[PDB]
Amino acid sequence: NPCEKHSCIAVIDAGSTGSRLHIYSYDTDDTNTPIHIEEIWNKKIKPGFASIQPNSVTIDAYLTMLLADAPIHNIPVYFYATAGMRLLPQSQQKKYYDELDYWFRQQSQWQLVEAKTITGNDEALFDWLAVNYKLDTLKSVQNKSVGVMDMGGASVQIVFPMPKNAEISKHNQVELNIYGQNINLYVHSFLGLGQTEMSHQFLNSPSCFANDYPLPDGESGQGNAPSCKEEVTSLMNSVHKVNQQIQPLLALNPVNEWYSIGGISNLASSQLFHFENSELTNQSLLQQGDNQICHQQWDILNGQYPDDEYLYQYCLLSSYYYALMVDGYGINPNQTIHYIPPEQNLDWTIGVVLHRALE
Amino acid sequence: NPCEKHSCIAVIDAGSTGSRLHIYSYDTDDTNTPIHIEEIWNKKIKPGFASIQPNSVTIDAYLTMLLADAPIHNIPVYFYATAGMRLLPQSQQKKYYDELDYWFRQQSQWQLVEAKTITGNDEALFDWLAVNYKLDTLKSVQNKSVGVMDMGGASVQIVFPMPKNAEISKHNQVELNIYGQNINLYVHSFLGLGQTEMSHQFLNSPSCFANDYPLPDGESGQGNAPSCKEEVTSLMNSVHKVNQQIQPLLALNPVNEWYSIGGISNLASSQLFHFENSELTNQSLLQQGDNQICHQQWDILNGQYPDDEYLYQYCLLSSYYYALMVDGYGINPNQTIHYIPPEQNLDWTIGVVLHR
Numbered sequence: 001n002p003c004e005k006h007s008c009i010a011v012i013d014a015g016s017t018g019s020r021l022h023i024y025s026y027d028t029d030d031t032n033t034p035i036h037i038e039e040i041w042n043k044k045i046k047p048g049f050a051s052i053q054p055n056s057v058t059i060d061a062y063l064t065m066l067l068a069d070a071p072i073h074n075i076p077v078y079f080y081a082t083a084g085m086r087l088l089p090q091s092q093q094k095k096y097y098d099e100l101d102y103w104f105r106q107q108s109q110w111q112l113v114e115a116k117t118i119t120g121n122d123e124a125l126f127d128w129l130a131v132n133y134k135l136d137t138l139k140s141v142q143n144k145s146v147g148v149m150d151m152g153g154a155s156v157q158i159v160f161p162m163p164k165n166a167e168i169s170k171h172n173q174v175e176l177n178i179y180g181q182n183i184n185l186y187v188h189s190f191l192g193l194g195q196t197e198m199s200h201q202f203l204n205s206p207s208c209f210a211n212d213y214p215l216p217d218g219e220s221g222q223g224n225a226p227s228c229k230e231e232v233t234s235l236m237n238s239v240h241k242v243n244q245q246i247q248p249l250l251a252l253n254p255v256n257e258w259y260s261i262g263g264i265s266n267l268a269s270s271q272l273f274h275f276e277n278s279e280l281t282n283q284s285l286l287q288q289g290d291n292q293i294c295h296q297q298w299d300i301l302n303g304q305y306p307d308d309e310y311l312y313q314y315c316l317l318s319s320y321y322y323a324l325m326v327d328g329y330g331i332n333p334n335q336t337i338h339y340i341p342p343e344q345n346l347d348w349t350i351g352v353v354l355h356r357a358l359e
Numbered sequence: 360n361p362c363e364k365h366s367c368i369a370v371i372d373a374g375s376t377g378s379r380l381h382i383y384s385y386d387t388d389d390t391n392t393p394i395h396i397e398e399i400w401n402k403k404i405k406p407g408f409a410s411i412q413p414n415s416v417t418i419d420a421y422l423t424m425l426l427a428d429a430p431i432h433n434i435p436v437y438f439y440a441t442a443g444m445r446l447l448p449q450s451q452q453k454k455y456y457d458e459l460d461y462w463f464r465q466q467s468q469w470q471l472v473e474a475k476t477i478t479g480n481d482e483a484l485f486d487w488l489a490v491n492y493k494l495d496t497l498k499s500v501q502n503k504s505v506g507v508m509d510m511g512g513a514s515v516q517i518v519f520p521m522p523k524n525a526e527i528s529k530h531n532q533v534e535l536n537i538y539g540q541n542i543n544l545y546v547h548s549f550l551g552l553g554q555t556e557m558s559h560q561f562l563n564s565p566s567c568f569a570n571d572y573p574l575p576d577g578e579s580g581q582g583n584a585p586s587c588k589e590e591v592t593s594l595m596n597s598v599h600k601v602n603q604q605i606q607p608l609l610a611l612n613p614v615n616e617w618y619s620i621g622g623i624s625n626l627a628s629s630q631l632f633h634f635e636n637s638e639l640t641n642q643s644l645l646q647q648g649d650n651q652i653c654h655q656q657w658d659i660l661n662g663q664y665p666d667d668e669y670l671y672q673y674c675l676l677s678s679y680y681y682a683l684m685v686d687g688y689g690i691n692p693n694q695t696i697h698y699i700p701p702e703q704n705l706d707w708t709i710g711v712v713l714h715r
C-alpha cells in the first residue's frame with residue numbers, strides 16, 4: 001500500500017457515459033507541486049451519473065458500485081462531473097449533489113473534498129495539465145506553445161498558451177503557478193459540439209453514414225466524408241461561430257504543437273485506420289474515413305468489425321473531427337496532430353492532482 | 360371496470376423524455392372503427408426509455424413502475440417508441456426490445472401486440488389523427504385545411520393536407536381512409552429539432568437567457584430574443600434545411616387552422632405568458648418572451664416566480680418556437696396558432712386507437 005508512504009487522492013471523472021474513479025499516489029517537490037504521480041486504481045461504471053434517477057436508493061447503489069473493490073480506502077475524494085451534468089437545469093443538478101453529499105457523510109472511509117459540476121473551462125485547464133504532465137513540459141519554461149484538444153462524448157475543449165488579455169472574458173483565461181513558473185492559458189469548451197450532441201443533428205444525413213446504413217427516417221446511408229464534413233461545418237460555424245471565436249486567437253497566439261485526447265485517439269488507432277507515431281493529419285483522417293468507411297457497404301463493414309460499438313458513426317466522426325479542427329479552429333489540414341495512444345486511455349484527471357482550485 | 364362493456368386498448372407513447380401509458384375504452388361504428396374513445400387511465404414516468412441502462416433489472420423496474428399499478432391489465436398493449444429510440448442504432452434498440460418482450464412474456468395479463476420504434480412519418484400521422492379526433496373534424500369532409508404541429512423533446516412533427524405528389528418522397532405522404540372519407544396528408548418529422556435536443560446547442564449562448572442567468576461555462580445571460588431566434592434559425596435552415604423542405608409545400612397547400620401539441624402548450628399556458636382561448640401568434644410569443652424573460656434580471660425574475668423549474672428556459676424556448684414556425688415552416692408571424700390545453704396531456708396515442 002503506497003498510500004502509507006505517499007500522498008494519495010481519488011478523482012472521479014463523472015462524464016456522460018459513465019463515472020471513472022482513479023486513485024493517484026504522488027510526492028510533492030520544494031515548490032510544493034505534485035511529482036511522481038502514479039495511478040494505482042482505475043475503475044469505470046455505467047451509466048453516466050446525470051442519467052440516473054436523483055434519489056437516495058439509486059445514488060447510494062451507484063456510489064457503492066463505483067467505490068466497491070477499491071484496494072485503498074481512507075483517502076480524499078474529488079467528484080467532478082462534466083458536460084453530462086452541465087446539460088441539466090441547475091435545480092436538477094442540486095438534487096444529485098444533495099443526495100451524493102449525504103451518502104458520503106454517513107460513511108467514514110472516503111473523505112469527500114468536493115462534489116460538483118466543473119465548467120468546460122476548468123475541464124480544458126485539466127486537459128492541458130494532464131497532457132503536459134505526461135510530456136514532462138511543466139517543470140521548465142517552454143520555448144514552444146503546446147495546444148491541447150479534448151474530443152469528448154458530451155463536450156469538446158481547446159486550450160493553448162495566451163498572455164493575460166483585458167479584451168477576452170476572464171472565464172476563458174487561466175493563470176497558474178506550477179513548479180515555480182507562471183503559465184497563462186486560453187481555455188474554451190463547447191457542449192453542442194460534443195460527439196453526442198453533434199451526432200443528434202446529423203443522424204438523417206446520408207453523406208455521414210456508410211452506404212445502405214439504415215437512417216432513422218427510413219432512407220439509406222451514401223457515405224461521402226467531404227459532403228458530411230461540409231454539413232457539420234454549418235453547425236461549427238453558422239450556428240456556433242467557432243471560426244470567429246477561435247481563429248483570431250490562434251493567429252495572434254500561434255501553437256507550435258497539437259496534442260489530442262478523447263474519441264479521436266480511439267478512432268485513429270482503430271484497425272480501419274493507418275497512422276504511425278501516434279499522430280495524424282486532418283487531410284489523411286478525412287481521406288481514410290471516406291475510403292475505409294463512408295464508401296463501404298454497411299452490412300459488409302458491420303460483419304467485418306462486430307462488437308465495435310461506435311463503428312456506425314466512423315464516417316461521421318472522421319468528417320466531424322475535420323470540420324472542428326480545420327474549418328472551426330483553422331488548423332492546417334496537413335499539420336501534424338499528436339494523439340495520446342488509446343491504451344493509456346488518458347482523461348483530464350491527472351490535472352486535478354496538479355491543481356486543486358476551480359473557477 | 361369500463362372494459363367489461365367496451366373495447367379497450369393500452370397505448371404507450373415512449374418518447375424521449377418519458378413514457379406515457381394511456382388506457383382507452385371505445386365502441387365502434389359499422390366499419391369497426393373506434394368511436395366514443397375515452398381515456399380511463401393515464402400514467403407518465405421519467406426518464407425516456409431509451410435513456411435507461413439496457414439491462415434486465417433496469418428495464419423490468421421501469422416497465423413495472425409504468426404498468427404495475429394500472430387498474431386494468433388483460434387488454435392489448437401497443438408500446439410505440441419515438442425519437443428517443445431513433446437516436447440509437449438498431450443493435451442498441453434491439454437490446455431494449457428483447458428485455459421488454461421478456462418482461463411481457465412474464466406478466467400474462469397484458470397482451471403485448473407490438474413493441475417497436477415507429478417512424479417519424481407514422482408518428483406525424485398519429486399526431487394529425489389524435490388532434491382531429493379531439494376537434495371532431497373526422498366525421499365529415501372539412502372545407503378547411505387543418506395542420507398539426509407536435510413540439511416534442513427530441514423530434515418535431517408537421518402534418519397537413521396535401522394531394523398525392525410525385526415530387527415528394529412517399530416516405531413524406533400518406534393516404535388514409537377514416538369514417539369513410541379519404542385524406543391525403545403530407546407528414547414530416549425533424550430529428551434533433553425537439554426542444555431538449557435543440558437546447559443542447561444553445562446553453563452557453565448569452566442571447567438565449569435572462570440577464571445575469573449563470574450559464575454552464577460561467578458567463579452571464581444577456582437575453583435578446585431576436586439574436587437567440589437567429590441562432591436557432593441557423594440550426595433550422597443552415598443545418599437542417601427546414602425552410603427549403605417545408606415552405607414551398609405550405610405555399611401550395613395553405614393551412615387555414617394550425618393546431619399544436621407538446622411543449623408549446625406548456626410554455627404558452629404558463630403564468631409568464633398571457634394568451635386567451637388557448638391560442639397565440641408567433642409575433643406575440645416572441646415579443647412576450649423577449650420583454651418578460653430575455654430582458655429581465657434573472658435573480659429578480661426567479662424570486663418573482665418561484666414555482667417553476669423551466670422558467671429559466673423561456674427566453675430560449677420563445678425564440679425557438681418562433682424560429683421553427685416562422686423561419687422554418689414559413690408561418691405568418693401574425694397567424695393564430697391553437698395549442699391544446701396542457702391539462703389534456705394530449706399526445707398522438709389516440710391516433711393508434713384509430714389507425715393500426
Ligand SMILES: [Cl-]
Nearest residue numbers: 216217479550
Ligand atoms: Cl427520423
Ligand SMILES: [Cl-]
Nearest residue numbers: 086120575576
Ligand atoms: Cl459548458
